[PDB]
Ligand binder design. Structure first.
Ligand SMILES: CCCCCCCCCCCCCCCCCC(=O)OC[C@H](COP(=O)([O-])OCC(O)COP(=O)([O-])OC[C@@H](COC(=O)CCCCCCCCCCCCCCCCC)OC(=O)CCCCCCCCCCCCCCCCC)OC(=O)CCCCCCCCCCCCCCCCC
Ligand SMILES: CCCCCCCCCCCCCCCCCC(=O)OC[C@H](COP(=O)(O)OCCN)OC(=O)CCCCCCCCCCCCCCCCC
Ligand SMILES: CCCCCCCCCCCCCCCCCC(=O)OC[C@H](COP(=O)(O)OCCN)OC(=O)CCCCCCCCCCCCCCCCC
Ligand SMILES: CCCCCCCCCCCCCCCCCC(=O)OC[C@H](COP(=O)(O)OCCN)OC(=O)CCCCCCCCCCCCCCCCC
Ligand SMILES: CCCCCCCCCCCC(=O)OC[C@H](COP(=O)(O)OCC[N+](C)(C)C)OC(=O)CCCCCCCCCCC
Ligand SMILES: CCCCCCCCCCCC(=O)OC[C@H](COP(=O)(O)OCC[N+](C)(C)C)OC(=O)CCCCCCCCCCC
Ligand SMILES: CCCCCCCCCCCCO[C@H]1O[C@H](CO)[C@@H](O[C@H]2O[C@@H](CO)[C@H](O)[C@H](O)[C@@H]2O)[C@H](O)[C@H]1O
Lengths: 179, 198, 49, 69, 486, 469, 91, 56
């Protein structure tokens, strides 16, 4: 893999999250009920600014950091980032259990979101429609979506491991009489 | 049980005849809960209609062929006999039994028989015997287990490879087959594993 | 026994002629849980007559 | 004696016939998934009659030199 | 003759019986005993010397929708039986008439709706075993939810409403992830049939995924820890047929689902993710047993026991051994004999007499209700797994195979032999013990209808407890088809 | 056939009093049935997906559009029977459900605008037709001008539909500014890759989709469907959604959009979550229509989406009519009438309906479990096909959101069934009045199709594998 | 009695598309495994005879039978066809 | 009108609706027949007689 730049992305992410807080502040000031003005935007707003900034900071910082600590690109990183984000959002309610719950469940949802590829879109070339499928023809390596009538035994022993009934050679032939 | 024992006039009279009575769940209690609260001719009247419940008032060829307006009369005027019979059976703790000769039925204590439930004829004569048939069949299909077939095929593969045993005495071939089995292999599992052999 | 409950078990108001009155106008419940008709034959009796 | 089951052979043939028809449906399904999402002809897709896609334009001031290939 | 004329004769007879006598339960009991006999005839005509599927019939084909298909192209729902499916079929026809007859006199409002719904659930369960393709299985797996919801909500106890949403939402949740796995199978293999699905060797990385969706479902239906929280409620507030049908058959569907969908395919994922299964089954056993020790409602306790015995059965079937398969099946059979008897005792006897299920009232039945005491103790000692009862032979065999696969987990799970005795005998001692409760007046001893039922459910388990080998004639192939050992 | 209907009705209705309005509705109902019977053989022209361009290159006719045309007519022969056949010949049901004079003309004009959209091949026909469908439906909301809420509804729908017609025309003029064309056939793999038209086409999709209630602009349409009369709500809620979704499905605009993925996710969440606390029926069914619009949005991203769309739009329309019809029949058995236009508002008014008419509740359960996706009801086989297509093309997080949305929507779908099978004091025991024959037979036929139409799935698949392949 | 004696097929000689051959091979592999089990059972019976007849001498007279049993037990047992039907050892 | 009359009692529909009914029904019938013939020309149905008449 190629490492991430933690502070460069975190500074961009914070300015972005500050901008989103400004937009949501203005939109609330317009959509709200009672007498207001241009002052109320950052006074009477329910923490939209600190919500957005703390989330974007914590998410991107944790994803890039754990991508660099684990030294990989995968879904476990998005899980840790959603765990931080849940901590931040749940710290607003000043309770321990809801803080722990917000953390775990935001983390599981972002961790699933990284499992499925960390995108709401689709790859469109790793998909089944645009990829080889069906029966492989002649002894060729079995890809993901391909089907096979008879699998190699060496590949089985490697993917699984030996023992628990599963062996390099069958049991009868292994114990056949040399006759 | 009978075939064409339906009768229209009896039911069409019995409708208002029951309507003249009070409701079943209040006839035998008199709104206080005492059997004696009812009168005597009233008591015999109720018991004699209730005995009618277990009487053959319809038959198979009468239910398959007659119309809805008559069957509805049977249904809604038989439900009343059902209710009266059973409310009295619980409250008085008697059943109505018309003896042989006298045409006058009244509540009575004898309950050691003459009372059957509607679910017996079905179950004891169609379910249970079928379960017993299932048991018999499981037992006599167990004879077709593979253990006996495999014992028989092993003895035969031995006699094929080694025909000589057949001329030996008839209560020694068992031990000889045992010796020959313990000697070698008469399975062919390694003959089906062909590509396994390098 | 009967008190009207919801899809989520929440309390629900039982609607009658009671709260089409002039006392329950000029409130600010959302469009979902308002219960004022504006087109009932109790309010629209004298209507463009 | 009342045990009168179908033989092993007829059973195996019937199951084979079923599996054969299921494989036939499998091949038909794949072949149609391929027949769709295959490029068609312009006539089958837009216009059977005027199958020339090429757009001829106006005629009120048709300038020689405006056609091209 | 005309097929349509025969069923028109049946429907006509049914309409006349409905019109004269305004009740159906006699006809339904007749149809139930008829189905039992016809299934027995199929067993007589079933060859045990063939691993193939017999009595195949296809439905809803393009050429002949409302009939049967003899085509060379099969695009419809398939049906047929192996000996595995025939076993549970015999269990289901055996129970359906009893589930109707356990409710012959206590249902008094809209009775005919109840007996319709019971028979529809029982017939749908029956056809689920004949299923030979993933989609027909699924559409008969999910078809019991509307009927169970309606049945529970109308004829249920106090807290029926909460129970009905629980049986629906939980089971629907697990079923939907099962649908995802089936849909991935169906867009890949382009075929779903339980005949040649073991030939197709998918890649391991995809078996690792399909397995998760199948197992999420089976966790929710079996049930298994930590999705074991719907079963106590749905049993507690259900009518007596709902509880008998559920514990006896619907929880056995999860086991049939494993053996028929999850093992012949996804073999390598089973042999890779089995230890996680052993974790989950072990937690199911002990925690549910210990949770049972501190309950107050009678029917809930029997429910928790059902979770435990299913969790033992999962140890055996997921053990990659013959004895594990033959034990886990026999557990399912004997459990579907014993548990309905207990749900009858605690739901159609005591609740009928006194209309309450709290243990604190019940004490001293032995004085005035002795025969009920005898049945309680017999069924209690059969539930826990006293030998010469199928609920022991299945416990032993599954723990043989669970010990083989992982000896530690298969031996730490032997404490079920104890914990089942604890949570069942702490109760049986209270009921049969002590001086008669002041809160309860007297009522009749058990009637002959209920004695009929309990004696059937005990004779059957005593038989398979005395000679389990009778069931091998159907299963001697199935103990070896689903074994992945080189 | 529509045109000769619309032309003839204008004269024939101007010549006719207020007292012939029901018979005139009945006439056009039978006429539409004769069309759908006698001209239906034209499906043969679309063998092997032979596609035709008409009126130059303005219109396009393929099997997709023809089936949508038959469906819109089947909807419009059921929606007309609801106005032209009185349920009960009582004074209350005369006052409650009486057609106006110009209503039927506006219906047919909205049918025409619906069909010009799906049949469109150029943006100019689309803009003319969406304005026709939009203006006709401003008036349909407003025709019952004796109600305050409908007046408010038409006004809001006019303004917030005008804004979206502005957005659509702004997008078209941008496409023309870029490419000097009004036709999407002038696109292809080369022009898609080579040019930055993503913004210019999502703006089209959104300007069309916000006219059908897609999130987060769902509220205004929900306020409209609630505030308008029930027999208008059953038309406005369906036909506009069919037309615009079909145009967006036929034209493979948004193949793998990220914006569409986000919004479609938000619709499934909103339409599933926000409909839980609702106590009113119409808002509940509007949030249901929204989550179903979410499911159908998810196949704008596929490029092979015809079967899944056609099967789902058909069962949605059927279940949508049937459930609103059950609600209409139940007005006889309730205790309180809330309005002359919306006799039934709150779900707690259907309490005890099992004890009055039980087979009406059987129909409600079949229809509800069809919405949820319980087999063997048609809704299962519809949501299954969507799951097949999205998983075949590479959307996984969305399938989980789809599953989750179905579960959450079971709760507001089962609220009706739960209160209906509840118990009630003061039950019905007899009633000498009787509901109409036709409306009962229509409801029954829709129920029987939702129940047993799984029998024909292979036959439908064969016909599809010929005429759509 | 009519003792059937079916035909022996193997997975290595068939194509997996002709289902009848696959069922024949499955049943063959399973039947031969059962025969191996029966041979083990006969060894067990003879061992018990040698023990019950010998007594203290069993340590000698039953030695080879006992070792034969303990060598056969881990191998002569059901182990299923799928692990050979779904695995070619030649690769 | 036989199935669900417009008032409480059956009465045969007025000749006004019957006349308009006949006009629209002829229009539907002509549109169907104009279509059936057009499809004999396009080659969608059996067109032997029309082939020979055009060749003549
Ligand atoms: C998937 C695959 C599933 C596989 C399933 C396998 C198939 C299942 C088989 C089901 C069989 C069902 C038969 C049936 O329907 O019975 C209904 C019927 C139900 O009982 P019921 O009497 O009508 O109940 C009403 C009350 O009696 C009326 O009330 P009551 O007032 O009269 O109260 C009396 C009641 C009240 O008492 C009690 O409550 C006591 C508790 C009862 C426990 C009963 C459990 C069985 C105990 C057996 C003990 C043996 C120990 C050894 O006590 C009893 O009824 C029991 C009496 C004890 C026996 C009498 C002693 C005579 C000797 O029972 C019978 O009619 C007789 C069936 C007996 C069959 C037993 C089998 C023995 C086999 C013989 C052995 C040798 C050959 C075997 C090989 C055969 C090869 C061909
Ligand atoms: C200015 C400098 C710019 C700097 C450059 C970078 C800028 C980046 C800006 C990012 C965008 C920020 C926009 C913030 C959202 C709009 C603010 C808002 O308030 O939205 C909600 C709005 C009003 O709600 P409010 O008045 O606050 O009342 C709340 C009570 N419920 O009510 C609404 O209805 C409007 C909702 C708008 C929603 C837009 C679409 C969002 C899509 C949802 C994503 C879902 C996907 C994830 C799903 C996961 C599934 C589990
Ligand atoms: C899959 C579709 C799910 C079906 C769920 C069945 C829902 C039925 C609940 C409503 C109901 O009451 O069923 C109608 C039933 C007759 O109901 P009944 O108890 O007999 O009331 C008096 C009859 N006139 O009529 C029936 O018998 C229907 C039984 C099914
Ligand atoms: C109708 C009422 C009348 C008023 C009309 C007002 C004018 C209308 C403006 C345009 C039309 C509205 C568009 C509505 C929003 C939806 C736009 C959209 O979804 O397009 C997204 C699309 C990419 O999305 P997609 O194709 O799905 O995925 C593939 C990505 N490679 O394509 C794109 O990638 C978008 C291109 C990215 C650049 C966006 C331009 C933003 C520039 C703003 C900078 C502001 C400066 C910083 C903040 C200032 C505040 C201080
Ligand atoms: C192995 C398969 C089953 C074998 C057949 C066993 C059932 C025979 C019928 C017994 C009737 C009986 O025992 O009576 C029932 C006794 C009655 O006590 P009582 O002596 O009559 O005095 C009456 C005085 N009361 C009324 C005060 C009690 O209730 C009991 O106190 C509960 C004890 C149950 C004993 C169970 C018998 C042992 C079986 C256990 C095998 C699992
Ligand atoms: C069409 C009227 C729709 C109105 C609503 C009624 C449903 C009718 C469905 C028939 C469709 C068809 O038969 O067609 C199959 C179409 C393509 O075939 P086609 O080109 O349109 O030719 C049809 C020529 N007809 C009109 C002369 C017959 O495949 C599809 O994707 C349709 C998917 C629809 C799923 C809904 C199933 C409902 C169960 C129907 C039980 C009778
Ligand atoms: C709960 C069950 C249902 C949940 C929904 C999800 C089910 C669908 C399965 C998701 C499949 C994802 O699979 C995706 O990643 C696999 C690797 O693992 C990739 O598979 C490809 O990986 C590359 C390595 O990067 C290798 O060359 C491999 O041989 C293959 O070609 C595919 O690009 C894609 O198919």
């Amino acid at each position: 893999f190629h490492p991430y730049n933690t502070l460069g992305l975190a500074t961009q992410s914070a300015m972005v999250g500050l901008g989103a807080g400004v937009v949501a502040a203005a939109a609330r000031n317009s959509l709200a009920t009672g007498p207001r003005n241009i002052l109320t935007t950052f006074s009477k707003s329910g923490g939209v600014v600190t919500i957005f900034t703390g989330a974007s900071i914590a998410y991107v910082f944790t994803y890039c950091s754990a991508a660099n600590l684990r030294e990989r690109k995968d879904g476990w990183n998005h899980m840790w980032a959603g765990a931080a984000t849940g901590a931040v959002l749940g710290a607003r309610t000043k309770l321990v259990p809801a803080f722990i719950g917000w953390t775990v469940l935001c983390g599981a949802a972002c961790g699933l979101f990284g499992w499925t590829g960390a995108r709401f879109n689709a790859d469109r070339k790793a998909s089944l429609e645009q990829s080889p499928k069906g029966f492989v023809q002649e002894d060729a390596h079995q890809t993901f979506w391909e089907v096979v009538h008879r699998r190699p035994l060496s590949l089985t022993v490697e993917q699984l491991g030996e023992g628990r009934g599963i062996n390099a050679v069958p049991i009868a032939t292994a114990t056949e009489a040399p006759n | 049980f009978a075939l064409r024992a339906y009768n229209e006039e009896k039911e069409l009279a019995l409708k208002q005849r029951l309507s003249q009575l009070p409701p079943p769940g209040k006839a035998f209690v008199t709104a206080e809960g005492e059997p004696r609260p009812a009168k005597e001719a009233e008591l015999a009247e109720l018991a004699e209609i209730a005995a009618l419940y277990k009487t053959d008032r319809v038959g198979i060829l009468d239910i398959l062929l007659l119309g809805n307006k008559h069957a509805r009369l049977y249904r809604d005027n038989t439900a009343l006999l059902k209710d009266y019979y059973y409310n009295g059976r619980r409250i008085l703790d008697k059943i109505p039994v018309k003896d042989k000769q006298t045409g006058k039925v009244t509540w009575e204590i004898k309950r050691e028989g003459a009372e059957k439930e509607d679910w017996v004829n079905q179950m004891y004569f169609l379910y249970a015997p079928s379960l017993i048939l299932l048991l018999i069949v499981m037992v006599y299909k167990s004879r077709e287990d593979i253990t006996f077939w495999a014992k028989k095929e092993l003895d035969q593969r031995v006699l094929d490879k080694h025909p000589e045993i057949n001329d030996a005495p008839e209560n020694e071939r068992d031990a000889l087959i045992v010796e020959r089995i313990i000697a070698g292999d008469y399975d062919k599992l390694a003959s089906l594993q062909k590509k396994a052999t390098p | 026994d009967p008190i009207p409950s919801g899809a989520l078990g929440q309390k629900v108001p039982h609607v009658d002629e009671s709260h089409q009155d002039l006392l329950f106008r000029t409130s600010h419940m959302v469009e979902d849980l308002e219960t004022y008709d504006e087109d009932s034959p109790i309010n629209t009796s004298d209507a463009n007559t | 004696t009342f045990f009168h089951p179908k033989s092993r052979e007829d059973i195996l043939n019937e199951e084979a016939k079923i599996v054969q028809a299921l494989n036939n449906q499998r091949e038909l399904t794949i072949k149609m998934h391929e027949l769709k999402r295959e490029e068609k002809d312009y006539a089958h897709s837009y216009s059977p009659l005027f199958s020339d896609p090429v757009p001829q334009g106006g005629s009120i001031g048709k300038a020689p030199g405006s056609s091209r290939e | 003759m005309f097929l349509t004329s025969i069923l028109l004769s049946s429907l006509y007879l049914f309409n006349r019986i409905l019109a004269w006598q305004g009740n159906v339960k006699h006809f339904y009991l007749f149809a139930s005993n008829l189905l039992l006999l016809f299934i027995v005839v199929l067993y007589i005509n079933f060859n045990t010397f063939s691993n193939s599927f017999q009595f195949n019939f296809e439905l809803f084909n393009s050429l002949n929708p409302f009939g049967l298909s003899n085509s060379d192209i099969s695009n419809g729902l398939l049906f047929g039986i192996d000996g595995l499916s025939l076993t549970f079929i015999l269990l289901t026809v055996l129970l359906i008439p009893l589930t109707l007859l356990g409710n012959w006199y206590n249902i008094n409002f809209n009775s005919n709706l109840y007996y319709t719904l019971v028979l529809a659930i029982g017939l749908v369960i029956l056809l689920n075993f004949w299923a030979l393709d993933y989609i027909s299985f699924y559409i008969l797996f999910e078809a019991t939810l509307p009927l169970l919801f309606i049945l529970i909500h109308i004829y249920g106890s106090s807290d029926s409403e909460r129970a009905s949403f629980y049986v629906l939402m939980f089971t629907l949740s697990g079923s939907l992830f099962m649908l995802l796995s089936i849909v991935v199978i169906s867009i890949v293999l382009n075929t779903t049939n339980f005949i040649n699905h073991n030939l197709f060797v998918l890649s391991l990385d995809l078996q690792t995924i399909i397995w998760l969706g199948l197992f999420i479902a089976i966790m929710v239906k079996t049930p298994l820890f930590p999705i074991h929280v719907w079963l106590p409620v749905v049993h507690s507030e259900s009518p007596l047929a709902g509880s008998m049908i559920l514990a006896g058959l619907i929880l056995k569907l999860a086991l049939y689902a494993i053996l028929r969908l999850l093992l012949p395919l996804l073999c390598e994922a089973q042999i890779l993710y089995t230890p996680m299964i052993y974790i989950i089954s072990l937690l199911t056993i002990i925690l549910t047993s210990l949770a049972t020790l501190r309950q107050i409602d009678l029917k809930v306790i029997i429910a928790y026991s059902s979770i435990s015995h299913m969790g033992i059965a999962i140890l055996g079937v997921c053990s990659n051994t013959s004895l594990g398969i033959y034990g886990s099946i026999v557990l399912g059979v004997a459990h579907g004999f014993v548990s309905p008897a207990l749900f009858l005792i605690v739901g159609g006897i005591l609740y009928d007499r006194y209309h309450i299920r709290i243990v604190n009232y019940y004490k001293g039945l032995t004085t005035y209700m002795p025969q009920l005491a005898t049945y309680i103790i017999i069924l209690s000692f059969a539930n826990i797994g006293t030998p010469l009862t199928g609920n022991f032979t299945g416990e032993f065999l599954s723990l043989q195979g669970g010990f083989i696969r992982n000896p530690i987990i298969g031996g730490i799970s032997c404490i079920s032999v104890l914990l089942a005795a604890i949570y069942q005998l702490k109760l049986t001692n209270k009921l049969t013990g002590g001086i008669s409760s002041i809160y309860m007046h007297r009522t009749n001893d058990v009637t002959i209808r209920e004695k009929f039922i309990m004696n059937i459910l005990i004779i059957s388990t005593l038989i398979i407890g005395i000679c389990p080998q009778i069931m091998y004639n159907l299963l001697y192939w199935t103990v070896n088809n689903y074994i992945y050992i080189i | 056939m529509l045109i000769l209907a619309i032309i003839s009705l204008i004269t024939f209705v101007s010549m006719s009093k207020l007292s012939d309005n029901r018979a005139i509705i009945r006439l056009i109902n039978i006429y539409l049935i004769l069309v759908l019977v006698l001209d239906s053989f034209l499906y043969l022209l679309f063998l092997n997906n032979q596609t035709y361009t008409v009126m130059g290159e303005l219109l396009i006719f393929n099997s997709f559009t023809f089936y949508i045309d038959m469906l819109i007519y089947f909807i419009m022969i059921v929606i007309s029977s609801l106005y032209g056949y009185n349920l009960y010949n009582n004074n209350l049901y005369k006052t409650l459900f009486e057609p106006k004079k110009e209503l039927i003309i506006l219906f047919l004009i909205n049918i025409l605008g619906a069909l010009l959209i799906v049949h469109s091949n150029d943006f100019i026909t689309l803009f003319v037709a969406i304005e026709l469908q939009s203006y006709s439906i401003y008036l349909i909301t407003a025709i019952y001008n004796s109600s305050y809420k409908a007046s408010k509804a038409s006004m809001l729908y006019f303004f917030m539909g005008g804004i979206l017609s502005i957005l659509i025309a702004y997008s078209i003029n941008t496409y023309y500014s870029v490419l000097n064309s009004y036709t999407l056939h002038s696109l292809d793999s080369l022009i898609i890759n080579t040019l930055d038209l993503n913004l210019i086409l999502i703006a089209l999709s959104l300007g069309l989709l916000f006219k059908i209630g897609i999130a987060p602009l769902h509220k205004w349409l929900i306020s409209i469907y609630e505030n308008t009369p029930i027999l208008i709500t059953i038309y406005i809620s369906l036909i506009p959604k069919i037309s615009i979704l079909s145009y967006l499905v036929l034209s493979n605009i948004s193949i793998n959009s990220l914006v569409i993925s986000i919004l479609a996710i938000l619709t499934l969440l909103v339409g599933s979550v926000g409909g839980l606390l609702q106590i009113k029926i119409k808002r509940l069914l509007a949030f249901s229509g929204l989550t179903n619009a979410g499911y159908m949005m998810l196949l704008l991203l596929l490029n092979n989406n015809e079967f899944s769309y056609l099967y789902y739009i058909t069962q949605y329309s059927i279940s949508h009519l049937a459930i609103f019809m059950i609600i209409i029949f139940s007005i006889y058995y309730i205790n309180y009438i809330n309005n002359q236009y919306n006799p039934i508002i709150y779900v707690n008014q259907l309490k005890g309906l099992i004890h009055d008419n039980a087979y009406l509740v059987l129909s409600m359960a079949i229809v509800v479990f069809s919405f949820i996706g319980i087999p063997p009801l048609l809704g299962f086989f519809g949501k299954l096909n969507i799951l097949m297509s999205i998983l075949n093309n590479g959307y996984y997080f969305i399938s989980i959101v789809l599953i989750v949305a179905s579960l959450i929507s079971a709760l507001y779908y089962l609220y009706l069934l739960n209160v209906s099978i509840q118990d009630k004091n003061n039950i019905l025991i007899n009633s000498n009045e009787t509901v109409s024959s036709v409306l009962s037979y229509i409801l029954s036929s829709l129920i029987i199709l939702i129940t047993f139409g799984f029998i024909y799935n292979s036959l439908i698949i064969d016909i599809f594998n010929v005429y759509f392949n | 009695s009519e003792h059937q004696r079916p035909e022996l097929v193997s997975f290595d000689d068939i194509n997996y598309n002709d289902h009848k051959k696959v069922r024949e091979a499955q049943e063959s592999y399973t039947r031969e495994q059962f025969i191996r089990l029966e041979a083990l059972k006969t060894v067990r019976k003879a061992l018990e005879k040698c023990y019950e007849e010998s007594g203290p001498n069993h340590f000698e007279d039953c030695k080879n039978l006992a070792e034969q049993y303990l060598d056969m037990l881990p191998t002569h047992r059901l182990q299923g066809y799928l692990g050979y039907q779904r695995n070619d050892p030649s690769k | 009108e036989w199935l669900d009359p417009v008032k409480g009692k059956f009465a045969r529909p007025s000749v006004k609706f019957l006349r308009v009914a006949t006009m629209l029904g002829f229009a539907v019938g002509f549109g169907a027949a104009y279509a059936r013939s057009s499809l004999r020309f396009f080659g969608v149905t059996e067109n032997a007689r029309e082939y020979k008449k055009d060749e003549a």
